[PDB]
Amino acid sequence: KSSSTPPRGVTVVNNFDCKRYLGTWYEIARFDHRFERGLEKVTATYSLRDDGGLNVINKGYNPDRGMWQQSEGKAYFTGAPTRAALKVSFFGPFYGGYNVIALDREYRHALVCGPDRDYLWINSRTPTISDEVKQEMLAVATREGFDVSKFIWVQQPGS
Amino acid sequence: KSSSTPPRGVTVVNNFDCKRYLGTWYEIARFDHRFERGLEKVTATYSLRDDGGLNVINKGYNPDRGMWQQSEGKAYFTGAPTRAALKVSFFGPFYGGYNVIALDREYRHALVCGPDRDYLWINSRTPTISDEVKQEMLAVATREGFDVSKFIWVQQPGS
Numbered sequence: 001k002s003s004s005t006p007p008r009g010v011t012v013v014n015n016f017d018c019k020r021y022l023g024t025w026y027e028i029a030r031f032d033h034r035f036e037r038g039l040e041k042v043t044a045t046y047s048l049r050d051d052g053g054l055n056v057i058n059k060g061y062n063p064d065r066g067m068w069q070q071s072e073g074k075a076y077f078t079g080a081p082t083r084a085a086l087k088v089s090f091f092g093p094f095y096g097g098y099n100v101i102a103l104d105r106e107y108r109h110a111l112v113c114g115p116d117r118d119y120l121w122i123n124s125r126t127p128t129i130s131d132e133v134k135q136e137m138l139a140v141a142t143r144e145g146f147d148v149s150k151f152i153w154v155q156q157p158g159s
Numbered sequence: 160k161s162s163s164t165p166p167r168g169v170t171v172v173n174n175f176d177c178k179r180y181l182g183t184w185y186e187i188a189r190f191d192h193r194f195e196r197g198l199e200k201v202t203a204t205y206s207l208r209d210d211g212g213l214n215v216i217n218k219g220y221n222p223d224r225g226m227w228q229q230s231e232g233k234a235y236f237t238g239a240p241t242r243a244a245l246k247v248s249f250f251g252p253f254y255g256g257y258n259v260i261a262l263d264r265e266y267r268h269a270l271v272c273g274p275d276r277d278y279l280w281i282n283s284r285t286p287t288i289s290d291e292v293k294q295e296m297l298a299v300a301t302r303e304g305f306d307v308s309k310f311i312w313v314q315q316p317g318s
């Protein structure tokens with residue numbers, strides 16, 4: 001399907017406050033994909049741009065090579081900035097939808113999907129999350145049609 | 160073969176001046192790979208790290224999506240810093256050898272290869288090169304066993 005639209009049916013957050021989502025997030029779990037392959041301790045960082053999009057810097061550690069790496073990209077809303085439907089673009093052939101489909105009131109925990117059900121992330125402001133938050137994230141993922149067998153639990157400080 | 164050694168039988172520069180190689184280079188031609196697919200107007204910018212490695216910033220334009228992108232990586236010598244054999248690594252699964260196989264004395268044109276003969280670049284301090292310089296670089300590539308018909312000639316200022 002189009003790499004520009006959300007997966008059909010997902011619950012895009014429609015009262016989004018972009019300022020509250022800025023800064024750094026820890027990747028608690030991801031569906032594994034080429035872009036991120038081999039990485040642990042992954043974080044994503046968002047900053048505002050003058051042009052109304054977001055600067056994205058993802059960082060992680062590759063324990064096979066013993067080195068940190070970083071990737072810088074840009075995200076732009078696909079519609080109104082109060083709707084958490086975006087597209088993100090990195091160097092090369094890494095481009096597609098970015099959608100926040102679950103978020104707590106305090107912007108502490110997020111479930112983010114790509115443009116299809118092969119792309120999903122559990123993110124947190126903290127490097128670890130409680131089992132209850134894990135359970136709820138998997139429950140939401142399942143209810144929205146995603147195959148939670150695809151998740152890998154990303155090593156983080158204290159995991 | 161090993162991703163960490165030069166291609167079999169390929170001679171690498173053995174009296175390398177790393178500091179003179181720093182700065183911005185324009186990519187005149189490349190063998191096509193996923194990492195850079197879709198990108199025109201490509202430059203690579205090298206700088207020194209406190210740890211003896213190089214920071215690498217690749218930047219290019221994707222005319223399909225209408226956007227500039229950049230990738231930041233690290234390169235380390237695999238041996239003596241006088242020998243232009245390195246390995247470069249970027250976010251995720253882009254890791255492998257980087258070898259300077261020909262350089263002019265002025266450090267204005269360089270032929271760079273990866274760890275096998277499927278990876279080759281013609282780089283220049285200027286965005287275009289003379290037919291003279293072009294043919295010589297192709298003759299070196301050819302001398303070293305590469306198939307120059309695999310080059311994509313990359314759109315650049317004045318090209």
Ligand SMILES: CCN(CC)c1ccc2c(c1)[B-](F)(F)[N+]1=C(C)N(C)C(=O)C1=C2
Binds near residue numbers: 026058112
């Ligand atoms: C499908 C298009 N695409 C490029 C692979 C993406 C889409 C969506 C995303 C990412 C990439 B990403 F790898 F930058 N990513 C990370 C690291 N985290 C923590 C995210 O929540 C997220 C979403």
Ligand SMILES: CCN(CC)c1ccc2c(c1)[B-](F)(F)[N+]1=C(C)N(C)C(=O)C1=C2
Binds near residue numbers: 186194253254255278
């Ligand atoms: C095969 C290992 N690997 C990562 C794909 C590379 C090896 C070698 C190189 C690059 C990548 B590269 F894509 F960063 N690259 C660029 C953009 N230019 C202009 C080069 O001279 C060069 C060499």
